[PDB]
Every structure is written in C-alpha cells, then in structure tokens.
C-alpha cells in the first residue's frame, strides 16, 4: 500500500541484524561488525595456544 501511494519511504524495512552478525562472525568485512574471524585481534581468529 505504501509503495502504491507513491510514498515508498514509509516501508517497514528491518535489517537482518542477527544473520548480519553470523556472516561477520565468519569473516565478512563488508558490514563492519569486527568480531570473530573478522576481528584480526580475536582469540578465534588467531587460535591462541
């Protein structure tokens, strides 16, 4: 309805911020979460022992 009435900015758009994290917790720099194999200082990134 919102797009049909020519005002598409009133859309309810939700970023999938709980699956944004997993792709950045697997090493995607593209979102800038900077955790867990995308954080190069991480214990999981370095496998510390």
């Amino acid at each position: 309805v919102v797009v049909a009435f020519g005002t598409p900015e009133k859309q309810i758009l939700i970023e999938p911020v709980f699956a944004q994290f997993i792709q950045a917790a697997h090493g995607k720099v593209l979102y800038g979460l900077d955790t867990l194999l995308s954080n190069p200082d991480s214990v999981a990134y370095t496998a510390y022992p």
Partner: peptide, 29 residues
C-alpha cells in the same frame, strides 16, 4: 516442587544465548 533439573538446563542454554550476544555487543572479544 522447585524444578531443579528443568531450570538447571534452561539456565545453561540461556547462558549460551547471553554469551553469543556478548560477542555481538562487543562485551567479550
């Protein structure tokens, strides 16, 4: 009765829910 064995494992799983959110909120790194 106070359900020890039920709440014992629910608080274990909820502690896993809170641990992963600490990585997502940068509390633990």
């Amino acid at each position: 009765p106070p359900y020890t064995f039920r709440t014992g494992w629910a608080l274990l799983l909820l502690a896993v829910n809170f641990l992963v959110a600490a990585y997502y909120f940068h509390i633990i790194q």
